[PDB]
Each structure stands twice: as structure tokens, then as C-alpha cells.
Design an enzyme around this catalytic site. Structure first.
Site, short mmCIF file in Angstrom:
data_model
loop_
_atom_site.label_atom_id
_atom_site.label_comp_id
_atom_site.label_asym_id
_atom_site.label_seq_id
_atom_site.Cartn_x
_atom_site.Cartn_y
_atom_site.Cartn_z
N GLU A 48 0.81 -1.20 0.00
CA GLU A 48 0.00 0.00 0.00
C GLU A 48 0.86 1.27 0.00
O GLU A 48 0.66 2.15 -0.82
CB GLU A 48 -0.93 -0.06 1.23
CG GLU A 48 -1.65 1.26 1.54
CD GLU A 48 -2.34 1.09 2.88
OE1 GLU A 48 -1.71 1.36 3.92
OE2 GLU A 48 -3.50 0.60 2.87
N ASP A 223 -5.41 -4.54 -3.90
CA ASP A 223 -5.65 -3.11 -4.07
C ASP A 223 -4.36 -2.33 -4.17
O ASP A 223 -4.36 -1.27 -4.80
CB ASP A 223 -6.56 -2.56 -2.94
CG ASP A 223 -5.90 -2.61 -1.53
OD1 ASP A 223 -5.00 -3.45 -1.25
OD2 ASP A 223 -6.29 -1.76 -0.69
N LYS A 263 -10.05 -19.21 -4.47
CA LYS A 263 -8.85 -19.58 -3.71
C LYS A 263 -8.20 -20.86 -4.22
O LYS A 263 -6.97 -20.93 -4.41
CB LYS A 263 -9.23 -19.76 -2.23
CG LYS A 263 -7.98 -19.95 -1.33
CD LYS A 263 -8.44 -19.98 0.20
CE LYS A 263 -7.23 -19.97 1.06
NZ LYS A 263 -7.59 -20.04 2.52
#
Ligand SMILES: OC[C@H]1O[C@@H](O[C@H]2[C@H](O)[C@@H](O)[C@H](O[C@H]3[C@H](O)[C@@H](O)[C@H](O[C@H]4[C@H](O)[C@@H](O)[C@H](O)O[C@@H]4CO)O[C@@H]3CO)O[C@@H]2CO)[C@H](O)[C@@H](O)[C@@H]1O
Ligand SMILES: OC[C@H]1O[C@@H](O[C@H]2[C@H](O)[C@@H](O)[C@H](O)O[C@@H]2CO)[C@H](O)[C@@H](O)[C@@H]1O
Ligand SMILES: [Ca+2]
Length: 697
Positions: A48, A223, A263
Site C-alpha cells: 500500500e 488493491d 482460492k
């Protein structure tokens, strides 16, 4: 002057005296060390943080045409946090895409780990491995691992890159109830010199018939790599054109397609009845950014594995990255055969997801899963579904519920606003995708304006609920009336959401008529400058999009741009010379003292300082949680934190203010001022984008 404010804040972030970066040039999570919230130490850092660093340097390049800073940031990312002459994924070539990994169930408490590798459900086939090898000649994963121990505070050392101080570390391993407080940090490269003899840390988390072998493994955060792509999209829009680095952003977007898979590569929808089917072709692709992809292998090692993730959080989707990776305008279409088509589908699906999750009030609800309970349980009857995935109001984590933080509103909605503007600017004002982006951002913007304040402070009760003029709690609703008081030079933005209900089942945008059974209460006003800076970009891109669409600002666009201007002015008054600074209170820092870090009975090992864990100060685990082990507390696992300059303050506050009978802080809460890297970049980039897109309007 907002350009000057951008440059001033930039200078502060990059100033070596301010402490945002390590001696290796790596950005820390925060200047301050005593902090625990997603990383559990301030001088960890995250993928991030790197993705925000790229965004910051892309904006610096726009103003200066000096792109050497963006390239230095990319180089530093690649050197320290992408594990690609040191082989940092040494057995990736042994990976078998026809059997990508061995199934284990997830469990509802950390108590229940290690989880047995039963192989109960054979993994489906991986359709990407062959294309990626065809494209790059190797399947070496070009994605950021999510977590570094930048100062080697945990003392594991860097096994596979001996000259580095920063170390690959991981924490979360033990399901939806394992908060940041409840992990056992461990090296990503584990040759069993630490942890339990002949086992390492692995046997806290998985169980096999035999002691685990030494092994390496990484986990990205989808993200973060998507934001890295978003930053490079903008750099190119602003003149950046070095193909050597643009090809790296493409390669990262290519491997990021692993976050699109269930997954264990089970067919999407197949476990609605509690019995999954092994996927084939692309039928295990959900075309969204799930929580992670992970990959790992032996440290005569001759094996490797990959998992996608079945749980999707709306706040991880990045339509700008998806646009960048699927269009000629975006410029970052990856070189693999089907990457363009995959990202094209993903962009549309992400916009459908946001519409599906759009609450009655306007906030976006949590997400969806292909693996109910993390063990392919049958879907509850009447649960709402989205492309045969089941609605979850708290994707992945329940401690705290992962969609209760207002930061997961502004972060995705900022990107929807960007895309609304991007579509309108090039003249797409009629596609289904444009109409979804437009509807979502209009409704959300109008929602948010009820709950963000400048020059005044909202009235709340002690539980954080906004109150109206009659002292009644404001529990959602369309036209809330919130009592206010004067607070010149200040801003207030929600921190929390309380959800109820579910969206109607998704049957496509043409069938959408609202979610009148999905509700949210907004609460807990804060002065979180990171959430603020993301919110201001959301306002600015939305406003700019109404002008690109219609030729001028709409009524709502004008409200948004005017509020953005006032928020930027108020925030600037809080610059302390290191960054935009606001006090924050921490109810939850009681968890620096709680005995809640689980270890199984019989498990004893060596931490990176040579100290035995869990050690002697244990209590038995809660029998109601199904485990057979013990708990210790934060500083028993991490005794070095008692040497932090802020530890005496925190410990004294606990001993003089915390009331265990009421569960409340009654003589003051732990109060901190933090300069977080990502938060200061959200603020800096808000000044810059207001300048670019609103200017003197
Ligand atoms: O069964 C095959 C294989 O499994 C390996 O174990 C996996 C787990 O199956 C997997 O669920 C687990 O996922 C973790 C991940 O490692 C953490 O890095 C990640 O942390 C997130 C965090 O929650 C976010 O707040 C932050 O933003 O991003 C990070 C990165 O996404 O949390 C997830 C669970 O939520 O990872 C294990 C691998 O380390 C076995 O180890 C292996 O033996 C098996 O062969
Ligand atoms: O996990 C999401 C995000 O959290 C950030 O910390 C938040 C925290 O979750 C919230 O409860 C508190 O009120 O605000 C802090 C600071 O915004 C964390 O900094 C991020 O790294 C993390 O991705
Ligand atoms: Ca818990």
C-alpha cells in the site's frame, strides 16, 4: 495556492529529517513507531505505502516533467518488495497449474489453527500459468508482497537477499477473527531457524501428517498492486513514456489477474449447494480483485503452489487500473493473450458490483464470496447473490468488520469518480459502464455531503452516533438533519458504518431498481486526514466529471467542488511541518494489553531475537472457541515494544484510565498524532488534483 501546497507537502514527505523513509530509501508505514492497525508496528511498511509513493511521484512528474523520481520509486519497490542475482521465488518453476495447491478449510477463530491440509476438494486448473510463461519465459510472480519489516525490528533477517536490512514478513494466517492484535508475525522465508524446532512458524497455521519442510511464501494485496497500476496510468496520461517502466506496470497488471480466481480454483457458484466443483478453463474466474493471491514453495526443494482468493471486498476494486489494463487510452494492456479481455470484463464487473452494493442511503456495502465460511459451505437460504457469489457484509475480516471503516468508502469511490471523469472526458456518456459509474458516484456523493463538515463540528452522543436537533440518533435515512456547532478551521469526516440488510439479488444493470432493504448508519466523526484527502479527490473528480459530461458543473458538482476547496483550506491549517496533523483517540489500544494471541498447546518456538514464545505468561484459550492452547498479550510476544518512547505514556494511560468492569476508558483515551505515509500522500494528491481539475473555477 494549491499547487504550492502540494509541493510543500511533497517536500515534507521527502525531507530526510522528517523520518518518512528508512536508510534504505524505503517508505515506512508511519513516521511514528508505536501504532497498530493493519501493520502492527509503525516501521513496517506495505505494498500500500509503495503504491502511494508511486502516485505521489507521478504527480510530481506531472508538474516538473522530472520522471526520475517515479523511476527511483519503482526501482526501490522492485528491489525490496517484489520478490523477483538472488532467487526470491526459488522453486516457482516447479509449480503445477493442473494442481495449484492443497485444500485446507478456514476457521472462525484463530483457536482452530493450524488447519489440516486435507486436500478434501481437489484444486481446479490454473488457466494463466501457460500464458504467462509464453509471454515472459518464466512464471516468476511480478507482484508486491504486502508487508516488510523495514528496520528488521523482528530480527528475522533477510534470508534470500543477504545485503538487505528490510525483511519480508507476514502476519495474518488464521481466518476472519484474527485481528491485527492476534497474529504471530513470522518470516516469509522460513528455514526453521526461528519458530518451533524442525517446523518453523508453519505449524502454527497448517498441519500435515509430518513436520513441515522449510519454505518460502508471499501474499499480495490486490488493491496495492492495482493502485500502482493506477499511478502509472496517470503518469502516462501526464507525459511519462519510458517503455522500460511501463512494461513493468503491464507485467504487474498481468500477474494481478491471479486475484480474479477462487482460492482453490473452484468453479464460481459451484459451492452454492456446499459441494464445490474443480474449475476448468476460466470458470473459476470471478473477474474481481479478491483479497489476495499467494504463492510459495520449498526452501532439494522441488514444489510450489498458488492460491487466488474466494472473498471479494468492494473497497479493493480499482476501475481505473482495470481501464488502464484493458484500453488503448489506458496504455497498459498486458502482453499476455487474454489479459485485455480479462481486464475488460473485470472493469464492467467491478461497476456492476458497486451498483449491486449501493445501499438505500448511498454507501457501498461489503462484497461477496465464492466460499461461504471459507470452507465452501452451502449459501444460507435467501442470501443475495452476484454472479453466483454470496453477499457478505464483512468480507474476509470480522474483527473489526471489514466494511465498517469509512476509509473503504472513499478509497474505492475516489476511483469510481476518476473513471466517471475519464469516460466523460473522452466522450463516452452513454455506455452501460458510464451509466453505472455515473449513478454510483452521484448517489454516493449526495450521501456523503450529509456527513462531512467544515468550519463546524457535528453533535454526537458518547457512542458516536450523530444527533439531530431533538437529540435523536441519526440512523441512516435519506434526508438526515444533523445538529452542528461552530468549529472554525476544523473538518470532521465519519470513521464508521453500521450495516443491516442485504442488496437485492443482481440480475444485471438493466434489472436494477435499487436496494431498499440494504441500510447503513454512518457514525464516529473523526479528523482522519488520509480519509479526508481521498474524499477530496473523490469530490474533485466527481465535479470535473459533471463538467466533462454536461459542459459545466451540475448543482451537485458545484457543491462538491466548493466543499473540496474549503476542506483543503481547513486541512492546511493543521500542517505541522512534518505533515497534516490531527489528534486521534484509540479505544482499541486496550488491545496492547489483552491476552488474546493464540498458540496451540505444546507449541513452543524461538522468535527472531532468540526469545522463547509464547513463553511463561500464558492463560488457557477460550473453550467456546474450540481450541486447545493458550493466549499471551502484545508485549509478551513483542517485548521490544516496551522500549518505544511512547510506551510509558500508553502503559500509564491503561493503568490509570481503563475500567475493566465497564470496558471503557474513563480518565482519558490513548491519544496520538500520526504522520502516516499513505495518509500524507492522500492529502498531497488532493491539493494537486484540485489544482489540475478545478483550478480557478
Ligand atoms: O492450502 C494451500 C496453501 O495455503 C497456505 O496458507 C495460506 C492460506 O491458505 C491463506 O488463506 C493465507 O492468506 C493470508 C495471507 O497469507 C496474508 O498475507 C493476508 O494478509 C492480508 C491482510 O489480511 C490485509 O489486511 C492486508 O491488506 O493485505 C494482506 C495481504 O493480502 O491474509 C490472508 C488471509 O486473510 O496465506 C497462507 C499463505 O501464507 C499454506 O501456508 C500452504 O502450506 C498451503 O500449501
Ligand atoms: O485496513 C485498512 C487500512 O487501515 C488504516 O488504518 C485505519 C484504521 O483501519 C481505522 O480503524 C482507523 O480509524 O484509521 C486508521 C488510519 O486511517 C491503515 O493505516 C491502512 O494501512 C489499512 O490499509
Ligand atoms: Ca478476534
Amino acid at each position: 495556492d494549491n499547487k504550492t501546497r502540494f509541493m510543500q507537502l511533497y517536500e515534507q514527505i521527502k525531507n530526510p529529517n522528517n523520518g518518512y523513509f528508512s536508510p534504505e530509501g524505503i517508505p515506512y508505514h508511519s513516521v511514528e513507531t508505536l501504532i497498530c492497525e493493519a501493520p502492527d508496528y509503525g516501521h513496517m511498511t506495505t505494498s500500500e505505502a509503495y503504491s502511494y509513493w508511486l502516485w505521489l511521484e507521478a504527480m510530481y512528474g506531472r508538474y516538473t516533467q522530472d520522471w526520475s523520481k517515479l523511476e527511483a520509486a519503482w526501482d526501490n519497490m522492485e528491489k525490496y518488495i517484489i520478490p523477483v542475482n538472488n532467487e526470491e521465488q526459488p522453486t516457482m518453476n516447479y509449480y503445477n497449474p493442473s494442481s495449484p495447491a492443497t485444500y485446507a478449510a478456514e476457521h472462525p477463530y484463530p483457536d482452530l489453527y493450524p488447519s489440516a491440509l486435507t486436500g478434501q476438494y481437489p484444486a481446479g486448473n490454473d488457466p494463466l500459468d501457460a500464458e504467462l510463461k509464453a509471454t515472459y519465459g518464466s512464471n516468476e510472480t511480478y507482484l508486491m508482497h504486502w508487508l516488510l519489516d523495514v528496520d528488521n525490528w523482528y530480527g528475522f533477517g533477510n534470508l534470500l537477499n543477504p545485503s538487505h536490512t528490510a525483511v519480508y514478513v507476514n502476519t495474518y494466517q488464521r481466518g476472519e477473527q484474527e485481528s491485527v492484535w492476534e497474529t504471530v508475525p513470522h518470516p516469509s522465508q522460513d528455514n526453521q531457524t526461528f519458530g518451533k524446532p524442525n517446523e518453523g512458524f508453519m505449524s502454527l497455521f497448517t498441519k500435515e501428517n509430518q513436520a513441515p519442510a522449510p519454505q518460502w511464501r508471499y501474499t499480495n494485496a490486490t488493491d496495492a498492486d492495482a493502485r500502482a497500476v493506477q499511478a502509472m496510468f496517470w503518469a502516462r496520461q501526464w507525459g511519462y513514456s519510458n517503455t522500460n517502466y511501463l512494461e513493468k506496470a503491464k507485467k504487474m497488471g498481468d500477474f494481478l489477474r491471479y486475484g480474479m480466481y477462487d482460492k482453490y480454483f473452484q468453479e464460481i457458484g459451484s459451492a452454492a449447494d456446499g459441494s464445490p466443483s474443480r474449475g476448468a478453463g476460466k470458470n473459476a474466474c470471478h473477474y474481481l480483485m479478491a483479497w489476495y493471491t499467494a504463492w510459495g514453495g520449498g526452501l532439494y526443494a522441488n514444489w510450489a503452489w498458488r492460491i487466488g482468493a474466494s472473498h471479494v471486498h468492494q473497497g479493493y476494486q480499482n476501475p481505473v487500473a482495470s481501464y488502464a489494463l484493458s484500453t488503448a487510452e489506458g496504455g497498459l494492456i498486458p502482453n499476455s493473450s487474454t489479459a485485455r479481455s480479462d481486464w475488460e470484463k473485470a472493469l464492467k464487473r467491478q461497476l456492476e458490483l458497486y451498483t449491486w452494493l449501493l445501499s438505500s442511503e448511498g454507501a457501498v456495502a461489503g462484497g461477496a464470496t465464492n466460499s461461504w465460511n471459507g470452507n465452501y459451505s452451502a449459501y444460507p437460504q435467501n442470501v443475495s447473490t452476484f454472479y453466483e457469489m454470496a453477499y457478505t457484509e464483512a468480507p474476509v475480516y470480522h474483527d473489526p468488520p471489514s466494511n465498517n471503516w469509512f476509509g473503504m468508502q472513499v478509497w474505492p469511490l475516489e476511483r469510481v469518480a476518476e473513471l466517471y471523469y475519464i469516460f466523460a472526458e473522452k466522450g463516452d456518456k452513454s455506455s452501460e459502464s458510464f451509466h453505472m459509474a455515473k449513478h454510483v458516484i452521484e448517489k454516493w456523493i449526495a450521501y456523503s455531503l450529509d456527513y462531512v463538515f467544515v468550519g463546524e463540528r457535528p453533535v454526537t452522543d458518547e457512542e458516536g452516533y450523530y444527533l439531530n436537533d431533538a437529540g435523536e440518533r441519526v440512523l441512516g435515512g435519506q434526508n438526515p438533519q444533523i445538529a452542528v456547532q461552530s468549529d472554525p478551521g476544523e473538518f470532521w469526516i465519519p470513521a464508521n458504518l453500521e450495516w443491516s440488510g442485504q442488496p437485492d439479488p443482481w440480475k444485471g444493470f438493466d434489472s436494477f431498481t435499487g436496494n431498499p432493504g440494504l441500510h447503513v448508519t454512518t457514525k464516529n466523526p473523526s479528523q482522519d486526514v488520509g480519509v479526508l484527502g481521498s474524499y477530496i479527490k473523490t469530490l474533485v473528480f466527481f465535479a470535473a466529471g459533471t463538467k466533462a459530461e454536461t459542459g459545466g458543473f451540475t448543482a451537485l458538482g458545484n457543491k462538491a467542488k466548493n466543499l473540496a476547496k474549503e476542506l483543503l483550506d481547513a486541512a492546511w491549517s493543521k500542517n505541522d511541518g512534518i505533515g497534516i496533523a490531527a489528534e486521534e483517540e484509540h479505544e482499541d489500544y486496550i488491545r496492547y494489553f489483552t491476552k488474546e494471541i493464540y498458540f496451540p498447546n505444546g507449541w513452543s518456538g524461538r522468535n527472531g531475537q532468540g526469545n522463547t514464545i509464547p513463553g511463561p505468561n500464558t492463560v488457557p484459550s477460550d473453550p467456546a472457541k474450540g481450541g486447545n492452547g493458550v493466549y499471551i498479550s502484545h508485549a509478551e510476544l513483542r517485548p521490544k515494544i516496551k522500549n518505544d518512547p511512547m510506551w510509558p505514556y500508553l502503559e500509564n494511560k491503561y493503568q490509570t484510565s481503563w475500567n475493566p468492569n465497564t470496558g471503557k476508558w474513563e480518565n482519558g483515551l490513548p491519544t496520538f498524532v500520526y504522520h502516516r505515509f499513505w495518509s500524507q500522500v492522500d492529502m498531497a494528491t488532493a491539493y494537486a488534483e484540485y489544482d489540475r481539475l478545478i483550478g480557478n473555477a
